[PDB]
Design a protein around this nucleic acid. Structure first.
Ligand SMILES: [Mg+2]
Ligand SMILES: [Mg+2]
Length: 1260
RNA sequence: AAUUUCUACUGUUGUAGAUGAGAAGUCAUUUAAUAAGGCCGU
DNA sequence: CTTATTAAATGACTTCTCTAAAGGACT
DNA sequence: AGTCCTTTACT
């Protein structure tokens, strides 16, 4: 039945399995007797510090390599001119002259870093363990003789002396870093990878500096006035200093002009993170301490000018920051608050503040509490001349009016009509002008609903009491302080103290808001002489003395926030090593002594055994011979990895090249690499074009050399005839496919048992809960995949292979063992629908039991579909099957809504809906859980938790362990209905959409290797014949619009559209003036009233209306109810009745059918057209929520679409109509796949007009 | 309320489904504080 | 609501490896 | 001349 019986074993992929190692017998006593666990704990803790130490030198190495770098200006100019040409031109002269302009600058930078002396040894044993003479140990000694303190920065390392001791630790362990070095090789690789400084510099930062140059020379034309240049040369003078101008090549250091920083040739001063910062600060500006105002930057000046002149085109020029330089550690040019290191720095800094604010005394020798009560009681008693005392015309004045009158613009517009009773905003506003303007404002306002000056004098009269709110709290605070006055405990961010953190923050909040209440009075000395004001000097004298002392809260608040929001340190798992720098690194028999790990099977149980470093001859052929018996089945593992490297390494080995004796012709082929089309020639030689005859000649040389090799003839290779090969990666493929064998040896239980006793071998049981004797019923997909690693039916035709480089980990207990539900005590079942309301267990149940002991773990890499390697043009094979089978395929489409995390409509080749249902509640889920609410409240809790400085819990596992459920319902749907899955790209234009994206990713990854736990191991769908229906994930950029049976369509006009007629609202009717209304409506064709039906009718054509992309003659009725959300909430509006209420206001007669078209556009009134363009917005508003979708346009029967009542083949509400119309764009996409012709390229871009034509005319 | 680990579970020393790991780097977002500004509050 | 700066946090994205045996250094 | 940790081979 299934159309995918053939999409199996399409390509190989990598996976890793995890198990628990249960130690066996005396291994655990023998381990700790050698204290191997505590020892590895410390060697992780050093390995971290070791790579930290190294990086400090890769840091020095990046910076000196890059101030040496220079890019030839006319090379940049070659990139720029070509880079913009890529925009608005698709030409392949361009693509070629761009990849050649990009590759030459990377070549220029890669040559530079490849020649330096530090580079050679950067990745070998001489970096830390120079055999005779070592690079890092010099650098640490240079930087100690220069007294430069590299490890002030990180707490875990004291001085440079300690950092020597830690590099010394890894004497014989240079290989242990090989993978780390891999991560560092990546930092410099010229290849097209984002981990590289060369990639960051050419792919990331150059474009961004070029976009800003285009935005700098295009800003000057449209808004010359935007940037106050003189002030940024006076504010940002530090980060305009550039020693070299690279357009002039002058070497003197002097402050640049912006015209110079945007010299394309000066991009060279922004290569390092120092100059990245400087460029970014010209963009962003900086704070300074002592300065109250913040020194602005280019991006702010663009912003402030565009809100001044009300031009929102200027936003197009917001400059882009440059990404930090890779591996760079960097502090900012803007001020950075001092940090707290422990609790004791939190109690001390609090005391000293709240003490001064109690101890401080004004000039007049009056406390902060007395100065304010005196000052404010005086205002409520109106003893103060109100012209003397002003408010700041600020967000602070706006906050006042909201707090006291419950609308912000109240004070604003009250003083704007009393002035008129051209004037600028005043910097400050007097209290008298406030009391008069609102005194006359309330004269016009209603007596019930009016805002009195006496409500303002309420707010402040009451300020003094905030200090008695604080005094009793600053006193139980004294209790809490004693608890944490401990010189480095740092045990206050431990979630147990969260009740005490709530107390400390309410102090800090009450004292913050009190500041934000006084703030409206303060007259900052921000140096403006443009205006001055004549205050009440006495009041301002002793106020502004108080205010400054309280202002010292905002640096206090940040420090405490910044220490209590810190996540507490957590003990994690660490690697285990059992004394081998190279442990489990390679399973092969010949490496068993170098890598210590061996596997065993006994009685369908799996074991891992790791010999003592001192006894690794334990399992040599001798010991396997005199200890053959029927106990344990040792796996013996034979691999030939990477044939393309390994057959040349071994045949042409200086050791053994003479024995294999290649002819001077085969050497010819090797040195010039004629056997390959893009392979490397031997050093000293030049690469020659690929010669097929040479290619089979070489392959034959390999073939003879494999039978001459003593060991590799044991594999039993059955190659194709070398005249079948067209390329040498095909021979390598056979060598690798058949270079992997698993045999066994039976070993006396008595032998294993006495060797495990003596600590000669550490034996574990590889375990998950399916290897429980009690486990009946489906194993995890992972248990399947591992058991097949050794199944006889896997081993005749290998589809599951066992990768080298497996790891073992220790995990210390993390929560106390608590017996959450005692044994034989019934426990109630959470499922209200279960038959058993409770259930009793003969045994104890312990919550999170896996975490109440220490455990050992085994991570194991495997390779799937081992033999059938790779798939190019995968989509092309999918598309091929789909064309031929396109009558049979169904479209599953999946949309997101506001109500729905995800929704699905299954539609057939016609357009009928087979299934439609939500995913807010799964299955078949015996415990209905509306996950839309579960996540909703888990997300609220987090925003709530961020604000009270409580711990921020993870949402991703909740979300993932949820989509895991729907991708299971999506696999079942696709295989059963022979479907393709169609999603929305991302009309329709961040947390509800990442649960939608997260679904797509777990579905692409699950369609990579789909196994039905139920299908027979031997046949398609099962362990050996697993469905592959998606091409492997690489980049979202490389992936594009299709990845297998998954497709993406443009998502426009899927929400708002009629399912039955295809109508869409593109009129976009808005009102601005009477003339455009009286001009829009006339553009109609007919506006009549239907008598026999009882609504209004607006017949028209779209083309006549202004926008040109508009095709179709439609008739749109006011039939039905409708919804609209107002602030008093939503109300039911009948527009058919709302129009009757408007015509009879303005005397138009409608009750006999006469077309009213002419009457409306003749009338002058603004109100008349305002409710009419409104009742038109409601006539066309198809989605109505508080939820359902309604349609004005009749079908042939003259009926109108309502989601409340629709057949099963049509949507049930606007959300399913969303996904239904994604599936209609899929039905379109199916089309172009069926009617695709051979040799051609599929087109997968739907334009809105080919869509409209297809949804509009399908029904009609 | 048990887990290689995650979710929901009682599915009975576990049930269903999911599960590519280690290292490395980078980016985006949220919330808070702050600076200057906009508008038919939030 | 914007444009910015600092801090603390969670999350998501692109790189590399998933080896046996040659080869050399200390012994 | 044996042990065993480090590079090696290519693309
Ligand atoms: Mg199970
Ligand atoms: Mg749980």
């Amino acid at each position: 039945m299934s159309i995918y019986q053939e999409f199996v074993n399409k390509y190989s992929l990598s996976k890793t399995l995890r198990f628990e190692l249960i130690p066996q017998g005396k291994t655990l006593e023998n381990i700790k007797a050698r204290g191997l666990i505590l020892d590895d704990e410390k060697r992780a803790k050093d390995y971290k510090k070791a790579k930290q130490i190294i990086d400090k030198y890769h840091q020095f190495f990046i910076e000196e390599i890059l101030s040496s770098v220079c890019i030839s200006e006319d090379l940049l100019q070659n990139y720029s001119d070509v880079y913009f040409k890529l925009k608005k031109s698709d030409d392949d002269n361009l693509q070629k002259d761009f990849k050649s302009a990009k590759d030459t600058i990377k070549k220029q930078i890669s040559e530079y870093i490849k020649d330096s002396e530090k580079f050679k040894n950067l990745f070998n044993q001489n970096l830390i363990d120079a055999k005779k003479g070592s690079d890092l140990i010099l650098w640490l000694k240079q930087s100690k003789d220069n007294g430069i303190e590299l490890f002030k920065a990180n707490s875990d390392i004291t001085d440079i002396d300690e950092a020597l001791e830690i590099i010394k630790s890894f004497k014989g362990w240079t290989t242990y870093f090989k993978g780390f070095h891999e991560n560092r090789k990546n930092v410099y690789s010229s290849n097209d990878i984002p981990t590289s400084i060369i990639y960051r510099i050419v792919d990331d930062n150059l474009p961004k500096f070029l976009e800003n140059k285009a935005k700098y020379e295009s800003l000057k034309d449209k808004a010359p006035e935007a940037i106050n240049y003189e002030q940024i040369k006076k504010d940002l003078a530090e980060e305009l200093t550039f020693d070299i101008d690279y357009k002039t090549s002058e070497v003197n250091q002097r402050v640049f002009s912006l015209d110079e920083v945007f010299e394309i040739a000066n991009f060279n001063n922004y290569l390092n993170q120092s100059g990245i910062t400087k460029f970014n600060t010209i963009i962003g500006g900086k704070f300074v301490n002592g300065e109250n105002t913040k020194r602005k930057g280019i991006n702010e000046y663009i912003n402030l000018y565009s809100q001044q002149i009300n031009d929102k085109t200027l936003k197009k020029y917001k400059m882009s920051v440059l990404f930090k330089q890779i591996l760079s550690d960097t502090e900012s040019k803007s001020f950075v608050i001092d940090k707290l290191e422990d609790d004791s720095d939190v109690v001390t800094t609090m005391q000293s503040f709240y003490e001064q604010i109690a101890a401080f005394k004004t000039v007049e020798e009056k406390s902060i509490k007395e100065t304010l009560s005196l000052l404010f009681d005086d205002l409520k008693a109106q003893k103060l001349d109100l012209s003397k005392i002003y408010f700041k015309n600020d967000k602070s004045l706006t906050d006042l009016s909201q707090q006291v009158f419950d609308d912000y613009s109240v004070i604003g517009t009250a003083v704007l009509e009393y002035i008129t009773q051209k004037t600028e905003k005043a910097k400050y506003l007097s209290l008298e002008t406030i009391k008069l303007a609102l005194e006359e404002f309330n004269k016009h306002r209603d007596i019930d609903k009016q805002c009195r000056f006496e409500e303002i004098l309420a707010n402040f009269a009451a300020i003094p009491m905030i200090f008695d709110e604080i005094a009793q709290n600053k006193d139980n605070l004294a209790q809490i302080s004693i608890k944490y006055q401990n010189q480095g405990k740092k045990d206050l961010l431990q979630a147990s103290a969260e009740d005490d953190v709530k107390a400390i923050k309410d102090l800090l909040d009450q004292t913050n808001n009190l500041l934000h209440k006084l703030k409206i009075f303060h007259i900052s000395q921000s140096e403006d002489k443009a205006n001055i004001l004549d205050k009440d000097e006495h009041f301002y004298l002793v106020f502004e003395e108080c205010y400054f002392e309280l202002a010292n809260i905002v640096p206090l608040y940040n420090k405490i926030r910044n220490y209590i929001t810190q996540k507490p340190y957590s003990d994690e798992k660490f690697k285990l090593n059992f004394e081998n720098s190279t442990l489990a690194n390679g399973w092969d028999k010949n490496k068993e002594p170098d890598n210590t790990a061996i596997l065993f099977i006994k009685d369908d149980k799996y074991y891992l055994g790791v010999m003592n470093k001192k006894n690794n001859k334990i399992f040599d052929d001798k010991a396997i011979k005199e200890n053959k018996g029927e106990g344990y089945k040792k796996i013996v593992y034979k691999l030939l990895p990477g044939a393309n490297k390994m057959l040349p390494k071994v045949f042409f080995s200086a050791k053994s090249i003479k024995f294999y004796n290649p002819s001077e012709d085969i050497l010819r082929i090797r040195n010039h690499s004629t056997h390959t089309k893009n392979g490397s020639p031997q050093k000293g030689y030049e690469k020659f074009e690929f010669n097929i005859e040479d290619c089979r000649k070489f392959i034959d040389f390999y073939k003879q050399s494999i039978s001459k090799h003593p060991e590799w003839k044991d594999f039993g290779f059955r190659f194709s005839d070398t005249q079948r090969y067209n390329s040498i990666d095909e021979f390598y493929r056979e060598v690798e496919n058949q270079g992997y064998k698993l045999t066994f040896e039976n070993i006396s239980e008595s032998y294993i048992d006495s060797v495990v006793n003596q600590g000669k071998l550490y034996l574990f049981q590889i375990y998950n809960k399916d290897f429980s004797a009690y486990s009946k019923g489906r194993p995890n997909l992972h248990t399947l995949y591992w058991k097949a690693l050794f199944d006889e039916r896997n081993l005749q035709d290998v589809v599951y292979k066992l990768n080298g480089e497996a790891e073992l980990f220790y995990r210390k207990q993390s929560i106390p063992k608590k017996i959450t539900h005692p044994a034989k005590e019934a426990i109630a079942n959470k499922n209200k629908d279960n038959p058993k309301k409770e259930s009793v267990f003969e045994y104890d149940l312990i919550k999170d039991k896996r975490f109440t002991e220490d455990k050992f773990f085994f991570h194991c890499p495997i390779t799937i579909n081992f033999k059938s390697s790779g798939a190019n043009k995968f989509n092309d094979e999918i598309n091929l099957l789909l064309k031929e089978k396109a009558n049979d395929v169904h479209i599953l489409s999946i949309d997101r809504g506001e109500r729905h995390l995800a929704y699905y409509t299954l539609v057939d080749g016609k357009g009928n809906i087979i299934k439609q249902d939500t995913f807010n509640i799964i299955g078949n889920d015996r415990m209905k859980t509306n996950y839309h609410d579960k996540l909703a409240a888990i997300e609220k809790d987090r925003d709530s938790a961020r604000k009270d400085w409580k711990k921020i819990n993870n949402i991703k596992e909740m979300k993932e362990g949820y989509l895991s459920q729907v991708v299971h319902e999506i696999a079942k749907l696709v295989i059963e209905y022979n479907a393709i899955v169609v999603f929305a790209d991302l009309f329709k234009r961040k947390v509800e959409k990442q649960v939608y994206q997260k679904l797509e990713k777990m579905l692409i990854e699950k369609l990579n290797y789909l196994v039905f736990k139920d299908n027979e191991f031997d046949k398609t769908g099962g362990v050996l014949r697993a469905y592959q229906l998606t091409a492997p994930f690489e980049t979202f950029k490389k992936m594009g619009k299709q990845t297998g049976i998954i497709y993406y369509v443009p998502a426009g006009f899927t929400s708002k559209i009629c399912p039955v007629t295809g109508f869409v609202n593109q009129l976009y009717p808005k009102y601005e003036s009477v003339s455009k209304s009286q001009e829009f409506f006339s553009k109609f064709d007919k506006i009549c009233y239907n008598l026999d039906k009882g609504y209004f009718e607006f017949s028209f054509d779209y083309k006549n209306f202004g926008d040109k992309a508009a095709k179709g003659k439609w008739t749109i009725a006011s039939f039905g109810s409708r919804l609209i959300n107002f602030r008093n909430d939503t109300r039911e509006v009948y527009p058919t009745k709302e129009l009757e209420k408007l015509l009879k206001d303005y005397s138009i007669e409608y009750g006999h059918g006469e077309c009213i078209k002419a009457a409306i556009c003749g009338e002058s009134d603004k109100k008349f057209f305002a409710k009419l363009t409104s009742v038109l917005n409601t006539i066309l508003q198809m989605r109505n929520s508080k939820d359902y979708l309604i349609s004005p346009v009749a079908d042939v029967n003259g009926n109108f679409f309502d989601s409340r009542q629709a057949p099963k083949n049509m949507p049930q509400d606007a959300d399913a109509n969303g996904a239904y119309h994604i599936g209609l764009k899929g039905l379109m996409l199916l089309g172009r796949i069926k009617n695709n012709q051979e040799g051609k390229k599929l087109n997968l871009v739907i334009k809105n007009e080919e869509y409209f034509e297809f949804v509009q005319n399908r029904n009609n």
